[PDB]
Structures are given as C-alpha cells and as structure tokens.
C-alpha cells in the first residue's frame, strides 16, 4: 500500500515537472508571438523525454559531484510528503518548519559546488546567490510565523478547517505580495535569476538533476501558496473536489511565474538586497506585530487541540 502511495506521489510529479518545462516553453513562445515546440510529437509532448535521453547520452571530487545534486533532489521530493490533498501522506505538526528546513538545505549543494570548483569566477556567483537565498528564506519564514497565529498550530491540516468559510488572502495580502516573491528568489527564478544571468560547473546529468529540483520547488511553493493563502473547498465528501481546485490554482500560479519571466528584466544584485533589507524587513516585522496584536485586541485567539 504505502509503496504504491509513494509511487503515486513521486512518478506523477516528475511527469508534471517535465510537462511543466514544456508549458513554460509554449507560453513563453506564445507571449513572444511564436508557437513553441509542435513537432517532436503532437503539440510537443515528447520534447521532455527527448531532452532526458540526450542529457543521459552526453559524456561528462566525486563525493561532492554526486552528493550535491542527489541531496538537492531528495530534499525537493521529500518536501511533498506532508502536504494535505486533502488528507496528507504524513500528518506532521511542525510540517511547515520541516518544509523550511528542507528548502534551506540545498544551499549546501550550491556552496559545495563552488568550494570544489577553484574558479574565483564560480565562488563569486555562488556567494552572491547563496546570500540572496538566505536573506529571502528569512522572510519566507517570518511570513508564516506571522500568519499561523490565526491557527495556533504549525500543522498543515488546520489551515483547511480554518479557511472553511473564508480564504486567507482578503486579510494578510500585504504578505501574499511577498510570499509570492521570495518564492522567486529561493527558486532563483526571475526577476532574481542573476545566478544564471552572469556567466563567464554543471555537467549534463547534474544539470538535469538541478533543473528537476528547481522546477519541483516551483510547483511546490505554488502549491503551498494555494494551500495557505488560497484555501480550497474542504467538503469532506469531495476530496476529489479539493484536489481539483488545488490543481487549478497551482497551475494558475505556475503560469503567473511565466508571465513574469517573460515580461520583466532582471534585478541588479545590490538593488535586490536593497529591496529586501529596506522594503520588506521593516514591513515584515511591523505586520508580524500587527498580527500578534490582532488576536489580543480581538477575541480571535485560536485553539490548540
């Protein structure tokens, strides 16, 4: 049974990541007025397998070389375990903290790659990206520490029974405007993808692994938003309906990422760290204090079963 469930949780998400690469290519093409892949197969549903075969065909410290990508991918996959859809695979109180930990770790891979590659050129960008990722994960954590006071438990099931009536966006949107952005930094996506913008050491295989984990994290952060700030409908007789609406909103966010990647330019590193340290951190602290006071100058102090 359990192995069956883990397969259902791991194989389809890899399939979806591949077809997500596809969807990216297609939407970017349609926004740049071109088509996109329409040839390898009907409307381009084989280009991903083509890329996989090609990469695994390409020729090339083994310790770091292997542990880094493996580590990143394993973390990205484990991140999925504790999610409710609607009843989760692993119900863990403190699940979102487990999420944050396993999302922050990959910095170790990013850093080992650099410390191995003697290239000063490589350490340059490695340090830069590591610092930006760290600094944005900080706020990624504080936002949850400021919202979850609405449900006095770090669980991920209580979110649903909370949002039963209303969502979590009509309030807290001063945060969603952030949690929908830091997610564009930890992922090193645009407009913060400088780590892939300024180039002057990832082989084919490890590059495939890095990219797999990157797009997995994309899907997963979008799902986290759809669960936290966009509460679905939990009518207990319709777990199917829950999963369906969740799918819809996840796809919507994953296409918003692409609207962004197409439209905007990239941020200059200094301008970016300025953005964070001088626009989001003060607001973040003040809004956390606000949501700390709310359940005191209002009866809305929630329970802990």
């Amino acid at each position: 049974m359990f192995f069956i469930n883990i397969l259902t949780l791991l194989v389809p998400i890899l399939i979806a990541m591949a077809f997500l690469t596809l969807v990216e290519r297609k939407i970017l093409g349609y926004m740049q007025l071109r088509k996109g892949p329409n040839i390898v197969g009907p409307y381009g549903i084989l280009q991903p397998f083509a890329d996989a075969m090609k990469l695994f065909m390409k020729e090339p410290s083994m310790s770091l070389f292997i542990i880094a990508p493996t580590l990143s991918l394993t973390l990205a996959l484990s991140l999925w375990v504790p999610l409710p859809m609607p009843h989760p695979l692993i119900n863990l109180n403190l699940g979102i903290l487990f999420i944050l930990a396993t999302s922050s770790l990959s910095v170790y891979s990013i850093l080992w790659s650099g410390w191995a590659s003697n290239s000063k050129y490589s350490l340059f960008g490695a340090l830069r990206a590591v610092a930006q990722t760290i600094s944005y994960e900080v706020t990624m954590a504080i936002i949850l520490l400021s919202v979850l006071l609405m449900n006095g438990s770090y669980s991920l099931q209580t979110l649903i029974t909370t949002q039963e009536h209303m969502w979590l966006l009509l309030p807290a949107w001063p945060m969603a405007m952030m949690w929908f952005i830091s997610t564009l930094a930890e992922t090193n996506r645009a407009p913060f993808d400088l780590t892939e913008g300024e180039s002057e050491e990832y082989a084919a295989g490890p590059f495939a692994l890095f990219f797999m984990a990157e797009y997995t994290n994309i899907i997963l952060m979008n799902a986290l938003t759809t669960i936290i700030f966009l509460g679905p409908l939990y009518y207990i007789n319709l777990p199917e309906l829950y999963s369906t609406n969740f799918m819809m909103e996840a796809l919507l966010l994953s296409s918003t990422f692409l609207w962004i990647r197409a439209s905007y330019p990239r941020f200059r590193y200094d301008q970016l760290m300025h953005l964070l340290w001088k626009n989001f951190l003060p607001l973040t602290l003040a809004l956390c204090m606000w949501h700390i006071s709310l359940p005191i100058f209002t009866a809305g102090v929630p329970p802990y079963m």
């Binding site: 093409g29 349609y30 926004m31 740049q32 007025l33 071109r34 962004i260 197409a262 439209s263 905007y264």
Partner: protein
C-alpha cells in the same frame, strides 16, 4: 527644431494627492501589472510562425542565391568569355579559361566559381551583356563538405537546364526596371 525629453514643464507640487498616487504605484505595482496585461494581450493573439518545409517565406523576383548559366532557345550557351564577371567580381572568386571552339565560334573551357567567396552581390548578372549568368532564387544548397561548393561550368549548366523554367519569368518581369 529641437525638443526636450525627460523633463517636466516646470517644478512639481507637493500635493497629498500626488504623493498618494506615487505611494500607490510604489506599493501595488500598477505599471508592472500593466506590463503583465500587455503580455497577456500578445498571448491571446495569432503567432506569425510558419512551417518551413510546408510553407516558405515571401520574396521578389530579384533574389540572389544559387547561380545558373543559361542558354538560348536553340540550345546554345550564352557565355562568350567577355570576362566582365571576372574583372568586376569584388572577391576575385570567378576563374575563367577560354578557347576557340572546333566549329570556329568563341566559348569557354573553364568557368569556375567558389561559392565560399561569392558574396551574392549581383554584379555579374549586371555586367553580363547577354544575361547568361543569373544569380538565382535557390537558397537550399547547403552541403556537408567544402567541395560541393566549388561549382564549375557543368554544375552551372545543369542548374540552368534545371531552373530555366523560373528564371525566364523572373527576368521577363524584372528586366524593364533595369
């Protein structure tokens, strides 16, 4: 009649309303959202893409691609070794070696080109007083070796005997302009 960009007609105001609009555009990102809307617009449009092997782009009879010597309707060639193409070819590409012909007439024995040097300009078909050589429309003659591109008299003759069903009309249309 000069102008002025990036400059206000005068000093601005400190109106609370203007500060309010500024603050809004700095917080909620109106302009960025407008850009997203524009991208959405172009998403919902028709793409200019085309299937190449089954649809090929537009052109005009004046193209300049693969080369082609030519003939009269009576089978005879048109080149008579006037060498204008050689003396005008900016690249010095062409190589000619002429001779008599057993029938007494004047003709060639070597008219070689290097399509690696030919910049595809048009001067040879401008100079040739008999319209013999005509840089043609065929642009699909990419190859796999650097010796299928040192064309000679016989390859040019074959290309002419092949494409002459098109160059006739192209020129019949274009010559008046020149």
């Amino acid at each position: 009649t000069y102008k002025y960009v990036n400059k206000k007609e005068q000093e601005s105001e400190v109106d609370m309303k203007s500060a309010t609009d500024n603050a809004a555009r700095i917080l909620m990102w109106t302009e960025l959202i407008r850009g997203l809307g524009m991208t959405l617009s172009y998403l919902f449009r028709e793409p200019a893409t085309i299937n190449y092997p089954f649809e090929k782009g537009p052109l005009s009879p004046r193209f300049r691609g693969e080369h082609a010597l030519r003939r009269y309707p009576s089978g005879e060639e048109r080149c008579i070794a006037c060498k204008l193409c050689e003396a005008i070819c900016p690249a010095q590409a062409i190589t000619i070696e002429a001779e008599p012909r057993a029938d007494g007439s004047r003709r060639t024995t070597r008219y070689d080109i290097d399509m690696t040097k030919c910049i595809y300009c048009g001067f040879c078909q401008e100079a040739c007083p008999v319209d013999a050589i005509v840089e043609g429309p065929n642009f699909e003659f990419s190859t796999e070796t650097h010796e299928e591109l040192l064309y000679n008299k016989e390859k040019l003759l074959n290309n002419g005997d092949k494409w002459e069903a098109e160059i006739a009309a192209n020129i019949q249309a274009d010559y008046l302009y020149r």
